[PDB]
Amino acid sequence: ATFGAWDYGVFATMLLVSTGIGLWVGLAAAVPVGLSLAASFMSAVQVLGVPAEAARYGLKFLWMCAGQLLNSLLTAFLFLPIFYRLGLTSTYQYLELRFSRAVRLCGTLQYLVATMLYTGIVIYAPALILNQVTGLDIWASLLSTGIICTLYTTVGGMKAVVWTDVFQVVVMLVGFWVILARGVILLGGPRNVLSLAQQHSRINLMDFDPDPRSRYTFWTFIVGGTPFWLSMYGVNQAQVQRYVACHTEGKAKLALLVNQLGLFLIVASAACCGIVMFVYYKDCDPLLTGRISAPDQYMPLLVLDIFEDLPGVPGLFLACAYSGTLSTASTSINAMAAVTVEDLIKPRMPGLAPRKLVFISKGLSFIYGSACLTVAALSSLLGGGVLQGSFTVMGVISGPLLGAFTLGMLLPACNTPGVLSGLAAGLAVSLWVAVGATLYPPGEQTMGVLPTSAAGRPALADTFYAISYLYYGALGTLTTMLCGALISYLTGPTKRSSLGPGLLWW
Ligand code: NA
Ligand code: NA
């Protein structure tokens, strides 16, 4: 079952309309800002991953929202007050005010590399969907996705408005709910779906398994996901700039609350879609049967399976997962180019020119876009899910950056030697665990996948590399904090009297 004729027509019409809208807004109050904040992480990555994870691991996936809530509370009262009352353009200027320009450069480069890899996986996800629905080879699908993404970004100009992001979130939620409704009406009713999921053990919210090898758990979500969401929202420049651009500090807090509500809505809808998807494929699992090869192919298969008599709805869902992910990728790439120009190029060439800078920014946008496309191709060639891949790519690189920020805001004795040594230690540890886990992946029974049906190595691998992927970034943050403090107190602790008003204790 591939795209029908009307499915192609609907996808083409909506994609052309969205591309034209994005290339026309261009060439020719706390609610919207929070909704645009929410429609900056959510893309086709979540649409592909969260339902698959909820089907394979159960309803315990909802603790991702608890991790998001902890991050949102931390940002609202810990990072936002400083980043707002201080008014210092880029968040990495704080690392200059606190430690040194070396730390500022290190943090900026960390952000750039993490964003480039994350945007690569984000770009890969729509190519995966277009591969699976239209049968086009993954390489030609990636070529098409890159062409449309670079027309969005560079040759047409990014159009990111808070209002197009709101429309994206609305259509995402409505699509999840429509899939849910069709699935449940096909499967009898909500009571029967709940009974079949309770019998088959996909209702497993209260999971407090102490083992870090278990992929998903209350602990893995609160102490592994919170650093990820802090690196995504509380410290990330592209979000904190929106926080500071809001007039009055309370307005940013309200925007954060609206962002948290939107995130919870999206995650809950996707997890319900995942449980309904499992119950639909109860005795004829397509992965076991071999109809699909990876869990990332679960959701478009369900979309094309349950909308067979409604020609063109899979086309609409593909169009919305394509335009809405390419918008996020374009926004990330242009944010990367602006960060490079206004943090690393403009300071060191004072009188370069003002017309030189538009050319340089366009070049950086193209360069980052091509680099992210290469990341997408390598993500294809290495396999693996898009959700966990994005989580790992962001965590392993941005955990030490979060540790540096936390050491600056919390510990007055931290200095440039300590913070830089701790950043190095964090990157080393995160890369070690990530690469060792890639070489030796944990088994599915160890990870805790739930059973399906189709009727109808080094001794450090089994312990250290087998921990959950949500811990790769948190591990880096913790080793950054520990090494930074230990080296700061050895190399000469900064005196509080010799610190500007950037400490959290005021
Ligand atoms: Na998005
Ligand atoms: Na995403």
Side-chain angles (χ1 to χ4, degrees), residues 1-456 458-506:
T2 27
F3 253 22
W6 258 297
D7 296 277
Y8 281 111
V10 166
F11 164 52
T13 278
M14 193 173 196
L15 181 69
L16 263 59
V17 138
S18 263
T19 308
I21 283 267
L23 294 211
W24 195 87
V25 281
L27 308 171
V31 196
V33 196
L35 287 203
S36 93
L37 283 160
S40 95
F41 188 90
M42 302 333 210
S43 49
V45 162
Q46 280 70 51
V47 184
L48 289 193
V50 178
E53 301 292 56
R56 290 161 57 75
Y57 292 90
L59 213 29
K60 27 188 281 197
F61 196 84
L62 280 180
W63 294 108
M64 190 94 277
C65 301
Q68 293 162 347
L69 178 54
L70 211 85
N71 135 73
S72 261
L73 271 152
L74 278 165
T75 307
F77 304 95
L78 206 143
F79 297 99
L80 167 78
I82 282 179
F83 284 148
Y84 192 83
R85 289 171 222 205
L86 231 50
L88 54 103
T89 324
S90 193
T91 74
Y92 316 108
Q93 156 92 326
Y94 176 83
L95 299 173
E96 207 194 333
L97 282 141
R98 182 57 177 87
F99 304 112
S100 83
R101 275 199 27 83
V103 192
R104 186 198 177 126
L105 254 297
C106 287
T108 323
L109 290 186
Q110 234 160 344
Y111 157 80
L112 289 168
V113 176
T115 313
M116 192 258 321
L117 303 177
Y118 185 86
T119 312
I121 305 160
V122 161
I123 274 158
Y124 172 55
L128 208 173
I129 306 176
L130 174 76
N131 181 221
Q132 204 231 348
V133 305
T134 60
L136 187 52
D137 284 18
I138 184 56
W139 314 121
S141 324
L142 263 166
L143 189 30
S144 341
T145 319
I147 294 156
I148 309 161
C149 190
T150 315
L151 280 174
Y152 262 100
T153 300
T154 320
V155 236
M158 158 269 276
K159 89 299 198 172
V161 178
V162 299
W163 288 122
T164 234
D165 276 328
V166 174
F167 166 93
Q168 162 185 160
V169 152
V170 166
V171 301
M172 205 181 173
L173 241 38
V174 164
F176 276 133
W177 296 334
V178 156
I179 292 170
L180 258 162
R182 182 109 175 97
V184 182
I185 185 59
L186 283 179
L187 292 157
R191 281 192 214 120
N192 192 43
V193 176
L194 200 40
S195 148
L196 276 35
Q198 268 182 258
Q199 227 126 9
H200 290 350
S201 85
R202 316 283 140 147
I203 325 287
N204 41 7
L205 261 169
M206 285 327 162
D207 190 19
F208 304 85
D209 193 280
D211 197 357
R213 297 200 231 76
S214 179
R215 200 197 241 208
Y216 293 129
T217 298
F218 167 83
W219 312 110
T220 315
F221 276 125
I222 67 174
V223 313
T226 310
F228 174 86
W229 295 110
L230 282 165
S231 315
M232 218 72 215
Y233 282 107
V235 136
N236 210 280
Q237 216 294 114
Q239 262 66 239
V240 176
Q241 62 167 19
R242 312 209 200 101
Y243 306 161
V244 185
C246 263
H247 312 95
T248 315
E249 207 213 290
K251 203 190 274 176
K253 295 154 141 291
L254 260 220
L256 286 165
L257 158 76
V258 163
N259 166 69
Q260 198 31 61
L261 287 170
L263 283 181
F264 171 65
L265 266 180
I266 290 159
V267 172
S269 300
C272 305
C273 259
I275 303 297
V276 160
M277 173 173 76
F278 155 74
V279 175
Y280 187 82
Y281 293 119
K282 212 175 65 75
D283 328 285
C284 328
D285 188 73
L287 247 175
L288 222 48
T289 278
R291 219 214 299 193
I292 61 163
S293 198
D296 280 345
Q297 288 152 355
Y298 256 122
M299 182 93 159
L301 184 78
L302 173 87
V303 171
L304 267 80
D305 257 34
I306 70 188
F307 294 115
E308 196 204 33
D309 290 60
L310 280 197
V313 188
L316 196 97
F317 218 53
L318 166 76
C320 262
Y322 225 95
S323 327
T325 314
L326 291 202
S327 115
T328 270
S330 159
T331 262
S332 249
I333 286 156
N334 279 319
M336 248 183 303
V339 162
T340 313
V341 159
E342 214 254 347
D343 258 37
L344 313 179
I345 290 164
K346 239 147 81 166
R348 317 207 229 288
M349 333 164 183
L352 178 58
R355 178 257 316 257
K356 282 203 95 298
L357 287 172
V358 56
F359 167 96
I360 287 162
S361 324
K362 286 184 63 39
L364 282 170
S365 277
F366 197 90
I367 285 160
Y368 294 149
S370 317
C372 293
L373 202 58
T374 325
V375 187
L378 197 96
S379 193
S380 173
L381 199 55
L382 293 202
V386 293
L387 182 81
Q388 162 195 224
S390 61
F391 259 78
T392 298
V393 127
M394 190 53 84
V396 162
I397 293 194
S398 281
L401 184 49
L402 188 66
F405 272 106
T406 301
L407 277 172
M409 309 215 182
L410 255 297
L411 188 69
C414 201
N415 46 36
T416 309
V419 71
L420 279 172
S421 83
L423 274 145
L427 296 171
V429 174
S430 269
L431 270 167
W432 181 10
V433 72
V435 171
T438 292
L439 290 178
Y440 315 86
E444 305 227 305
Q445 140 169 294
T446 313
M447 277 190 288
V449 195
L450 302 177
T452 51
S453 147
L460 202 89
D462 42 63
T463 68
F464 166 48
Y465 307 135
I467 58 129
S468 176
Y469 75 97
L470 296 165
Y471 290 139
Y472 299 168
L475 203 70
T477 298
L478 191 62
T479 165
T480 304
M481 299 222 51
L482 286 154
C483 299
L486 195 299
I487 294 318
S488 318
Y489 261 103
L490 258 164
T491 54
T494 286
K495 267 218 274 214
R496 220 211 195 109
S497 25
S498 166
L499 253 175
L503 207 60
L504 254 171
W505 314 81
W506 328 100

